[PDB]
Short mmCIF file of all heavy atoms in Angstrom, two decimals:
data_model
loop_
_atom_site.label_atom_id
_atom_site.label_comp_id
_atom_site.label_asym_id
_atom_site.label_seq_id
_atom_site.Cartn_x
_atom_site.Cartn_y
_atom_site.Cartn_z
N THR A 1 129.42 76.26 94.13
CA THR A 1 129.30 75.68 92.80
C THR A 1 129.87 76.63 91.76
O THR A 1 129.64 77.85 91.83
CB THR A 1 127.84 75.38 92.40
OG1 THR A 1 127.08 76.59 92.41
CG2 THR A 1 127.21 74.37 93.35
N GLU A 2 130.62 76.08 90.81
CA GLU A 2 131.22 76.88 89.77
C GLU A 2 130.26 77.07 88.60
O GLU A 2 129.39 77.95 88.64
CB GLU A 2 132.56 76.28 89.33
CG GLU A 2 133.44 77.25 88.54
CD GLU A 2 134.67 76.58 87.99
OE1 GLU A 2 135.64 76.38 88.76
OE2 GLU A 2 134.67 76.24 86.78
N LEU A 3 130.39 76.24 87.56
CA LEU A 3 129.72 76.52 86.26
C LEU A 3 129.60 78.01 85.91
O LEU A 3 128.54 78.48 85.47
CB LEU A 3 128.33 75.87 86.36
CG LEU A 3 128.10 74.51 85.68
CD1 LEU A 3 128.67 73.34 86.50
CD2 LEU A 3 126.61 74.31 85.44
N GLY A 4 130.69 78.75 86.12
CA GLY A 4 130.64 80.20 85.97
C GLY A 4 131.95 80.97 85.85
O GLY A 4 132.73 81.08 86.81
N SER A 5 132.16 81.49 84.64
CA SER A 5 133.23 82.41 84.28
C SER A 5 132.77 83.00 82.96
O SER A 5 132.23 82.26 82.12
CB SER A 5 134.57 81.69 84.09
OG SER A 5 135.39 81.80 85.24
N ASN A 6 132.96 84.31 82.77
CA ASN A 6 132.39 84.99 81.60
C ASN A 6 130.89 84.68 81.64
O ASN A 6 130.33 84.04 80.74
CB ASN A 6 133.07 84.48 80.31
CG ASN A 6 132.64 85.24 79.06
OD1 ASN A 6 131.52 85.08 78.57
ND2 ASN A 6 133.56 86.05 78.51
N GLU A 7 130.25 85.11 82.73
CA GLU A 7 128.88 84.71 83.02
C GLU A 7 128.02 85.84 83.59
O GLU A 7 128.50 86.65 84.40
CB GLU A 7 128.89 83.53 83.99
CG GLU A 7 127.52 83.01 84.40
CD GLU A 7 127.54 82.33 85.76
OE1 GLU A 7 128.63 81.94 86.22
OE2 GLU A 7 126.46 82.18 86.37
N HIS A 8 126.76 85.88 83.16
CA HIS A 8 125.84 86.92 83.61
C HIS A 8 125.03 86.57 84.85
O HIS A 8 124.40 87.46 85.44
CB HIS A 8 124.91 87.35 82.47
CG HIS A 8 125.34 88.62 81.81
ND1 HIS A 8 126.06 88.65 80.64
CD2 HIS A 8 125.19 89.91 82.19
CE1 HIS A 8 126.32 89.90 80.31
NE2 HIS A 8 125.80 90.69 81.23
N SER A 9 125.04 85.30 85.26
CA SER A 9 124.33 84.90 86.48
C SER A 9 125.11 85.29 87.73
O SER A 9 124.53 85.43 88.81
CB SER A 9 124.00 83.40 86.47
OG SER A 9 123.47 82.98 87.72
N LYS A 10 126.43 85.46 87.58
CA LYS A 10 127.27 86.02 88.63
C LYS A 10 126.89 87.48 88.82
O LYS A 10 127.03 88.04 89.91
CB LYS A 10 128.76 85.93 88.25
CG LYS A 10 129.35 84.53 88.24
CD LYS A 10 130.87 84.55 88.04
CE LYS A 10 131.27 84.84 86.58
NZ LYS A 10 132.76 84.87 86.41
N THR A 11 126.40 88.08 87.74
CA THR A 11 125.95 89.46 87.74
C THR A 11 124.45 89.51 88.04
O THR A 11 123.97 90.44 88.70
CB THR A 11 126.25 90.14 86.38
OG1 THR A 11 127.46 89.59 85.83
CG2 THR A 11 126.41 91.64 86.54
N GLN A 12 123.71 88.50 87.57
CA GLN A 12 122.27 88.38 87.82
C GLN A 12 122.00 88.13 89.31
O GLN A 12 120.88 88.34 89.79
CB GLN A 12 121.67 87.26 86.95
CG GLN A 12 120.16 87.05 87.07
CD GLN A 12 119.79 85.72 87.74
OE1 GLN A 12 120.30 85.38 88.81
NE2 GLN A 12 118.89 84.97 87.09
N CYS A 13 123.04 87.69 90.02
CA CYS A 13 122.97 87.47 91.46
C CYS A 13 123.47 88.72 92.20
O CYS A 13 122.86 89.14 93.18
CB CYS A 13 123.82 86.25 91.85
SG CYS A 13 123.47 85.54 93.48
N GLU A 14 124.56 89.29 91.70
CA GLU A 14 125.19 90.48 92.29
C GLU A 14 124.32 91.72 92.21
O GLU A 14 124.09 92.39 93.22
CB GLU A 14 126.54 90.76 91.62
CG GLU A 14 127.76 90.27 92.40
CD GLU A 14 128.39 91.34 93.28
OE1 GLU A 14 127.73 91.80 94.24
OE2 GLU A 14 129.55 91.72 93.02
N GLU A 15 123.86 92.04 91.00
CA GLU A 15 123.13 93.29 90.76
C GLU A 15 121.67 93.25 91.20
O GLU A 15 121.21 94.09 91.98
CB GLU A 15 123.20 93.69 89.28
CG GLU A 15 124.54 93.49 88.59
CD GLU A 15 125.62 94.44 89.05
OE1 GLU A 15 125.35 95.29 89.93
OE2 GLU A 15 126.75 94.34 88.53
N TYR A 16 120.95 92.25 90.69
CA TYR A 16 119.50 92.22 90.83
C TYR A 16 118.98 91.37 91.99
O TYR A 16 117.81 91.49 92.37
CB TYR A 16 118.88 91.82 89.49
CG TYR A 16 119.49 92.57 88.31
CD1 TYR A 16 120.50 92.00 87.54
CD2 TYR A 16 119.06 93.86 87.98
CE1 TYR A 16 121.08 92.69 86.47
CE2 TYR A 16 119.63 94.56 86.92
CZ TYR A 16 120.64 93.97 86.16
OH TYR A 16 121.19 94.65 85.11
N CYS A 17 119.85 90.52 92.54
CA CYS A 17 119.50 89.66 93.68
C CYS A 17 118.33 88.72 93.37
O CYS A 17 117.44 88.51 94.21
CB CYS A 17 119.19 90.49 94.93
SG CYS A 17 120.55 91.53 95.54
N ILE A 18 118.32 88.16 92.16
CA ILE A 18 117.25 87.25 91.77
C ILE A 18 117.62 85.82 92.18
O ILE A 18 118.53 85.21 91.60
CB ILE A 18 116.93 87.31 90.25
CG1 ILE A 18 116.87 88.76 89.74
CG2 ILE A 18 115.63 86.54 89.94
CD1 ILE A 18 115.76 89.64 90.35
N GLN A 19 116.92 85.31 93.18
CA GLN A 19 117.08 83.94 93.64
C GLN A 19 116.80 82.97 92.50
O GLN A 19 115.80 83.10 91.79
CB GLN A 19 116.15 83.64 94.82
CG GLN A 19 116.31 82.26 95.42
CD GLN A 19 115.54 82.09 96.71
OE1 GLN A 19 115.83 82.75 97.71
NE2 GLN A 19 114.56 81.20 96.70
N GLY A 20 117.69 82.01 92.31
CA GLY A 20 117.54 81.09 91.21
C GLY A 20 118.71 80.15 91.09
O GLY A 20 119.87 80.57 91.19
N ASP A 21 118.39 78.87 90.87
CA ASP A 21 119.38 77.82 90.77
C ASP A 21 120.31 77.87 91.97
O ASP A 21 119.86 77.82 93.11
CB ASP A 21 120.16 77.91 89.45
CG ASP A 21 119.26 77.75 88.24
OD1 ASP A 21 118.20 77.09 88.36
OD2 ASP A 21 119.61 78.28 87.16
N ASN A 22 121.61 78.01 91.70
CA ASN A 22 122.57 78.31 92.77
C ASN A 22 122.79 79.67 93.42
O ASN A 22 123.60 79.80 94.34
CB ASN A 22 123.88 77.73 92.24
CG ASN A 22 123.76 76.26 91.87
OD1 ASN A 22 123.26 75.44 92.65
ND2 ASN A 22 124.22 75.91 90.67
N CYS A 23 122.07 80.69 92.93
CA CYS A 23 122.09 82.00 93.57
C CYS A 23 121.03 81.97 94.66
O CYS A 23 119.85 81.75 94.39
CB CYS A 23 121.83 83.12 92.56
SG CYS A 23 121.60 84.78 93.28
N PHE A 24 121.47 82.15 95.90
CA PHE A 24 120.60 82.10 97.06
C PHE A 24 120.96 83.29 97.96
O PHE A 24 121.62 83.14 98.99
CB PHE A 24 120.77 80.74 97.77
CG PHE A 24 119.92 80.57 99.01
CD1 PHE A 24 118.63 81.10 99.09
CD2 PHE A 24 120.41 79.84 100.09
CE1 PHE A 24 117.87 80.93 100.24
CE2 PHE A 24 119.65 79.67 101.25
CZ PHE A 24 118.37 80.21 101.32
N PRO A 25 120.51 84.50 97.56
CA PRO A 25 120.91 85.79 98.13
C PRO A 25 120.55 85.97 99.59
O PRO A 25 119.53 85.45 100.06
CB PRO A 25 120.13 86.81 97.29
CG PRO A 25 119.71 86.07 96.07
CD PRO A 25 119.46 84.69 96.54
N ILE A 26 121.40 86.70 100.31
CA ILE A 26 121.12 87.06 101.69
C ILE A 26 120.53 88.47 101.62
O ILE A 26 121.25 89.45 101.42
CB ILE A 26 122.40 87.03 102.56
CG1 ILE A 26 122.99 85.61 102.58
CG2 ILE A 26 122.11 87.50 103.99
CD1 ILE A 26 124.37 85.51 103.20
N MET A 27 119.21 88.56 101.76
CA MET A 27 118.49 89.83 101.70
C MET A 27 118.70 90.62 102.98
O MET A 27 118.77 90.04 104.06
CB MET A 27 116.98 89.60 101.52
CG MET A 27 116.57 88.72 100.35
SD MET A 27 117.25 89.25 98.77
CE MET A 27 116.44 90.82 98.55
N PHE A 28 118.80 91.95 102.85
CA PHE A 28 118.85 92.83 104.02
C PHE A 28 117.45 93.03 104.57
O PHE A 28 116.50 93.17 103.80
CB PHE A 28 119.44 94.19 103.65
CG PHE A 28 120.84 94.12 103.12
CD1 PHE A 28 121.15 94.72 101.91
CD2 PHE A 28 121.84 93.47 103.82
CE1 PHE A 28 122.44 94.67 101.42
CE2 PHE A 28 123.12 93.42 103.34
CZ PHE A 28 123.42 94.02 102.13
N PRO A 29 117.30 93.05 105.91
CA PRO A 29 116.00 93.26 106.54
C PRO A 29 115.60 94.72 106.46
O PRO A 29 116.38 95.55 106.01
CB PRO A 29 116.25 92.86 107.99
CG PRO A 29 117.67 93.24 108.22
CD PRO A 29 118.36 92.86 106.93
N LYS A 30 114.38 95.03 106.89
CA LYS A 30 113.94 96.42 107.01
C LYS A 30 114.75 97.10 108.12
O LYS A 30 114.92 96.53 109.21
CB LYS A 30 112.43 96.48 107.26
CG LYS A 30 111.93 97.67 108.07
CD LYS A 30 110.43 97.91 107.88
CE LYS A 30 109.87 98.93 106.92
NZ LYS A 30 109.94 100.33 107.46
#
């Protein structure tokens, strides 16, 4: 899904890994 350019949710997904809307992060295991 796009809806994203000049956007902080691309960064809100990249940096902080906060699951939300279309950000569905692949977490690293222990």
Side-chain angles (χ1 to χ4, degrees):
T1 60
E2 196 187 280
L3 259 79
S5 261
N6 186 287
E7 179 206 341
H8 260 98
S9 172
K10 290 187 285 179
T11 327
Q12 182 248 50
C13 197
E14 261 265 64
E15 319 290 0
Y16 314 97
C17 299
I18 316 297
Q19 183 171 296
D21 298 333
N22 305 311
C23 172
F24 179 36
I26 299 170
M27 306 307 295
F28 300 127
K30 150 160 262 282

